[PDB]
Amino acid sequence: KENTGSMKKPMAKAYEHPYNSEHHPLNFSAVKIAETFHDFIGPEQVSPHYESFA
Amino acid sequence: ATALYKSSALAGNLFLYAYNYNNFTANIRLRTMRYLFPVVSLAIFGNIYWDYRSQLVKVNLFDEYIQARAQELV
Ligand SMILES: CCCCCCCCCCCCCCCCCC(=O)OC[C@H](COP(=O)([O-])OCC(O)COP(=O)([O-])OC[C@@H](COC(=O)CCCCCCCCCCCCCCCCC)OC(=O)CCCCCCCCCCCCCCCCC)OC(=O)CCCCCCCCCCCCCCCCC
Numbered sequence A: 001k002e003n004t005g006s007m008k009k010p011m012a013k014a015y016e017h018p019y020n021s022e023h024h025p026l027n028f029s030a031v032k033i034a035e036t037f038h039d040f041i042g043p044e045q046v047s048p049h050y051e052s053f054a
Numbered sequence B: 001a002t003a004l005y006k007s008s009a010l011a012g013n014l015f016l017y018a019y020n021y022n023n024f025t026a027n028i029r030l031r032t033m034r035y036l037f038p039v040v041s042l043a044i045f046g047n048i049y050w051d052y053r054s055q056l057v058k059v060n061l062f063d064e065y066i067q068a069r070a071q072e073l074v
């Protein structure tokens, strides 16, 4: 009997806010400022060498 | 040069509002900027054009006088 089960059709989509995006988030937080910050300073500059540059 | 720079800096503010349009428009914490950004923009435009317009008037007054006074002296 369990094998005979089926699945209902779910809703197509929920509400899509016309003024919020992943790159331009509507509300503010320090998390998004952190993403923009580490994109500016770039990722950790990992050295492949065995001795320091200086 | 001064009028062109101050016009580009004003255009820069319009980009800042356009680049952040969704926040200035939908977030109520930024309503005061949405409401008063254009008033400041007009007051800035007015200063830019006022100075250019006044300078233009004076240059034309100066040019028409030296021509008239010169012919009298001739
Ligand atoms: C027409 C011809 C003219 C042009 C000719 C061309 C010449 C152009 C010159 C370019 C030279 C090549 C450039 C190479 C890279 C930059 C130089 C460098 O050393 O980088 C490697 C050096 C470390 O080498 P590393 O092995 O790759 O790093 C391994 C570790 O990650 C590091 O950390 P660690 O702790 O894990 O490991 C040990 C660490 C231990 O030591 C340290 O970590 C140093 C600690 C410093 C950080 C402490 C906090 C202070 C910083 C706060 C930030 C303030 C600035 C920002 C805020 C204002 C916004 C602008 O490093 C060391 O081993 C000793 C330090 C290196 C020797 C001492 C160098 C002192 C001067 C360097 C700083 C410049 C000061 C300003 C001078 C300029 C005056 C206007 O990087 C730095 O520490 C900072 C670099 C920033 C330098 C900016 C200035 C560039 C101009 C360089 C000219 C030479 C200096 C002239 C000053 C003379 C004063 C005595």
Ligand SMILES: CCCCCCCCCCCCCCCCCC(=O)OC[C@H](COP(=O)([O-])OCC(O)COP(=O)([O-])OC[C@@H](COC(=O)CCCCCCCCCCCCCCCCC)OC(=O)CCCCCCCCCCCCCCCCC)OC(=O)CCCCCCCCCCCCCCCCC
Pocket: A023, B008, B009, B011, B012, B013, B014, B015, B016, B018, B019
């Ligand atoms: C060491 C040498 C020194 C050289 C000095 C020069 C240094 C470089 C300068 C760089 C800054 C200037 C940028 C020049 C363009 C460079 C191309 C570029 O953007 O990089 C590649 C850039 C991609 O960036 P990516 O680095 O590859 O990756 C970005 C990530 O994906 C993330 O995507 P994202 O979209 O979020 O990234 C945005 C990205 C790129 O954002 C952009 O979309 C670039 C567009 C920036 C427009 C600048 C304002 C100009 C307003 C229009 C004036 C038009 C006048 C003529 C009108 C004729 C028609 C009547 O970054 C920026 O937003 C740059 C903004 C720079 C700061 C501007 C602050 C202004 C206030 C301070 C004023 C100071 C006085 C000077 C102001 C001068 C103003 C003339 O390419 C594009 O974005 C393609 C855009 C395609 C659609 C554009 C549609 C037109 C948009 C116009 C906006 C209209 C605003 C409202 C109207 C205002 C007029 C009344």
